[PDB]
Amino acid sequence: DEAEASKFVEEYDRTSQVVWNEYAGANWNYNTNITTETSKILLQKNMQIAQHTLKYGTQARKFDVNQLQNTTIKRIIKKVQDLERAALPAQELEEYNKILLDMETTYSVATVCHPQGSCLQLEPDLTNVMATSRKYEDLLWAWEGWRDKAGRAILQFYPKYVELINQAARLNGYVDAGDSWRSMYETPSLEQDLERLFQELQPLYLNLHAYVRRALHRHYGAQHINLEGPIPAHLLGNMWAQTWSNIYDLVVPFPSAPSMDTTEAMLKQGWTPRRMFKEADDFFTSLGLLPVPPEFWQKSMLEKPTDGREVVCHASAWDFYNGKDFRIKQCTTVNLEDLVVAHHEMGHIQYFMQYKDLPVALREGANPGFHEAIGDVLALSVSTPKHLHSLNLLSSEGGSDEHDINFLMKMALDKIAFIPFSYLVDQWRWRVFDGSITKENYNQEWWSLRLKYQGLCPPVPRTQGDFDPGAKFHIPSSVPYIRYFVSFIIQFQFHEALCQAAGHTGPLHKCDIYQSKEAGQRLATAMKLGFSRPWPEAMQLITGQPQMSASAMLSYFKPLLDWLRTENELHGEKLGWP
Numbered sequence: 147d148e149a150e151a152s153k154f155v156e157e158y159d160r161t162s163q164v165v166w167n168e169y170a171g172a173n174w175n176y177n178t179n180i181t182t183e184t185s186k187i188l189l190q191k192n193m194q195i196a197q198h199t200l201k202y203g204t205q206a207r208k209f210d211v212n213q214l215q216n217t218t219i220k221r222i223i224k225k226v227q228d229l230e231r232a233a234l235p236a237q238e239l240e241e242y243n244k245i246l247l248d249m250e251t252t253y254s255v256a257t258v259c260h261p262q263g264s265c266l267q268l269e270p271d272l273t274n275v276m277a278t279s280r281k282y283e284d285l286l287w288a289w290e291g292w293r294d295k296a297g298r299a300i301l302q303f304y305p306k307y308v309e310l311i312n313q314a315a316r317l318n319g320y321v322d323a324g325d326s327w328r329s330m331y332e333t334p335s336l337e338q339d340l341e342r343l344f345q346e347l348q349p350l351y352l353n354l355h356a357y358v359r360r361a362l363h364r365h366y367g368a369q370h371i372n373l374e375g376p377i378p379a380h381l382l383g384n385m386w387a388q389t390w391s392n393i394y395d396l397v398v399p400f401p402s403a404p405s406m407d408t409t410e411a412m413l414k415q416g417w418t419p420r421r422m423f424k425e426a427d428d429f430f431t432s433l434g435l436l437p438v439p440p441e442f443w444q445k446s447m448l449e450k451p452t453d454g455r456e457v458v459c460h461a462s463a464w465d466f467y468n469g470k471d472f473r474i475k476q477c478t479t480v481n482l483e484d485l486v487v488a489h490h491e492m493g494h495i496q497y498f499m500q501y502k503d504l505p506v507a508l509r510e511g512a513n514p515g516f517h518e519a520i521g522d523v524l525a526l527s528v529s530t531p532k533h534l535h536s537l538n539l540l541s542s543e544g545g546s547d548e549h550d551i552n553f554l555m556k557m558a559l560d561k562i563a564f565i566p567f568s569y570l571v572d573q574w575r576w577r578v579f580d581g582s583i584t585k586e587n588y589n590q591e592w593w594s595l596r597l598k599y600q601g602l603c604p605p606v607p608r609t610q611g612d613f614d615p616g617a618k619f620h621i622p623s624s625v626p627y628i629r630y631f632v633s634f635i636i637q638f639q640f641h642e643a644l645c646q647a648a649g650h651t652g653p654l655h656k657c658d659i660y661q662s663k664e665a666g667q668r669l670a671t672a673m674k675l676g677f678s679r680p681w682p683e684a685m686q687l688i689t690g691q692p693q694m695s696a697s698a699m700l701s702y703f704k705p706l707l708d709w710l711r712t713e714n715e716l717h718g719e720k721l722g723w724p
């Protein structure tokens with residue numbers, strides 16, 4: 147009895163490696179070369195992997211998991227009983243796979259065109275406009291044009307997508323697809339836990355919001371900024387206003403302490419996409435973690451092709467499920483933002499290598515937020531003045547109190563501003579999936595949450611037919627988002643624990659873990675667990691306790707909260723908005 151179950155998981159592991167490796171290859175070939183032919187092969191391989199999933203999932207459901215004694219085999223079999231989309235009848239499976247392909251292709255080939263003029267892609271053209279333009283109407287053209295072209299074009303697919311992903315979820319024992327996504331955390335209290343964490347970050351976010359609102363009022367005019375209202379969503383340096391660091395120049399706390407232009411420094415010094423990934427590789431190995439294999443450098447796509455191919459530029463990391471072939475696909479631009487992205491993606495690669503000897507069913511992060519956090523932890527140290535100076539991208543190490551608050555502001559514009567955005571995306575989607583939001587009010591309810599959580603308003607009133615969520619990659623690509631909220635909380639918990647392991651003393655935000663083998667050992671032991679144990683065990687291995695907690699992020703930013711409160715008080719800001 148226990149014997150049949152052990153044999154079954156062995157057979158599942160062997161066959162899954164082969165099939166998933168074949169699917170990954172077809173998916174890579176489409177993502178890096180969008181054509182009719184690669185689309186057809188991918189859709190065919192979708193059917194092949196579904197046949198495998200159905201065969202083994204059907205067997206798996208004949209085991210009474212309650213009677214199995216070994217907890218690891220119990221855990222694997224329970225997971226294989228979830229067929230995901232392979233539970234759908236053949237006709238609906240074919241339709242679902244085609245919808246997903248059509249949505250991701252539509253997002254990735256959308257362009258915004260001037261009349262009798264040039265046509266702009268999202269990466270790099272519109273991203274660069276949002277990051278560097280300081281003209282209200284040019285920012286508005288890019289913001290509205292992207293939503294008109296990408297968002298509106300996804301709307302025709304989204305209702306049927308919702309119907310089919312929910313149908314598959316119900317066929318696998320869940321009430322809807324949002325329920326199935328939340329289950330990946332194995333935490334019944336998840337929704338309340340995340341709400342409590344969000345509430346703890348409100349002092350910092352509200353004070354940052356009010357300070358940036360005041361600075362935007364100074365630049366864009368009192369007629370365009372309401373000092374007691376939400377901020378127009380096209381003014382924050384980013385297409386989705388999800389990170390705000392590109393408007394640092396407008397909000398510098400201490401302008402008498404100027405910062406080096408890091409992009410021109412990287413360009414002046416001949417940085418390339420390959421250099422950026424080599425620096426990330428060096429940071430990981432400095433911690434005693436694993437180098438990427440030679441195969442990684444031969445097969446990765448680290449810059450946008452120039453030979454005519456259309457590609458999915460959105461950065462991503464790829465496991466080919468054979469323990470040797472790992473790749474990154476990124477349309478890298480030479481700037482500091484993409485250097486952080488490179489570290490993020492290399493953290494995914496590191497996790498793939500650390501758990502490569504587990505059975506494939508357990509080759510995931512402890513929870514999805516853990517997978518997202520590894521690269522970001524290292525990038526916190528990369529971003530310090532100490533490390534950037536060592537890369538020749540900043541002129542000094544910043545001893546002065548002024549430089550210190552400036553640095554904390556630059557970090558807050560990315561890390562704190564992202565908290566409400568990352569919370570709200572799946573608050574919206576969870577309610578779409580549970581039927582609380584219908585196609586009658588997709589967009590209205592999106593903007594209700596953008597207001598409630600982020601304090602943003604659309605610069606142009608939305609109209610029927612708008613589908614602004616469709617203009618954000620993870621929506622048409624059906625990638626869950628709450629992982630990134632979890633990641634941004636726990637990455638500071640990890641930073642704090644690794645800095646302690648490294649012997650750092652003094653303020654947390656001055657810590658740089660480069661070359662700490664003690665810090666690397668903590669990470670490696672946790673990553674090697676994969677998905678074999680409840681995630682609180684990996685949390686306790688890294689941090690010495692088992693909970694998610696905002697206290698580390700609050701500690702990191704404590705000097706900035708103090709500065710922001712004083713600054714906002716003396717200007718008389720009214721925190722929040724109606």
Ligand SMILES: *[C@@H]1O[C@H](CO[C@@H]2O[C@@H](C)[C@@H](O)[C@@H](O)[C@@H]2O)[C@@H](O[C@@H]2O[C@H](CO)[C@@H](O[C@@H]3O[C@H](CO)[C@@H](O)[C@H](O[C@H]4O[C@H](CO)[C@@H](O)[C@H](O)[C@@H]4O)[C@@H]3O)[C@H](O)[C@H]2NC(C)=O)[C@H](O)[C@H]1NC(C)=O
Pocket residue numbers: 152153155156216217218219503504505678
């Ligand atoms: C419940 O079942 C799991 C899984 O068992 C494994 O899968 C089954 C489907 C079946 O094929 C089994 O035959 C198979 O073992 C058990 O978890 C495994 O437990 C073993 C032994 O505890 C682990 O073996 C380890 O494998 C490592 C591979 O890198 C190896 O390095 C380890 O070496 C350690 O010990 C040696 C000798 O002292 C030392 O030199 C090393 O330095 C290191 O300390 C070790 O051989 C598997 O990794 C486990 N697999 C998983 C997925 O966890 C589990 O034990 C069982 N439960 C009970 C209560 O028996």
Ligand SMILES: CCCC[C@H](N[C@@H](CCc1ccccc1)C(=O)O)C(=O)N[C@@H](Cc1ccc(O)cc1)C(=O)O
Pocket residue numbers: 460461462463486487490491494518522623625630
């Ligand atoms: C910095 C990384 C940017 C690129 C990253 N790319 C996805 C592809 C995920 C994927 C999964 C399955 C199939 C296809 C893709 C991934 O690697 O997680 C991403 O999207 N980050 C979020 C969220 C985010 C933002 C800023 C950060 O510092 C970290 C995270 C965002 O930019 O909104």
Ligand SMILES: *[C@@H]1O[C@H](CO)[C@@H](O)[C@H](O)[C@H]1NC(C)=O
Pocket residue numbers: 179181183184455
């Ligand atoms: C792109 O895909 C087509 C169709 O499969 C193929 O013939 C071509 O070789 C591919 N191009 C590259 C550069 O891989």
Ligand SMILES: [Cl-]
Pocket residue numbers: 386614615
């Ligand atoms: Cl939007």
Ligand SMILES: [Cl-]
Pocket residue numbers: 327330514515626627628629
């Ligand atoms: Cl998730």
Ligand SMILES: [Zn+2]
Pocket residue numbers: 490494517518
């Ligand atoms: Zn990621």
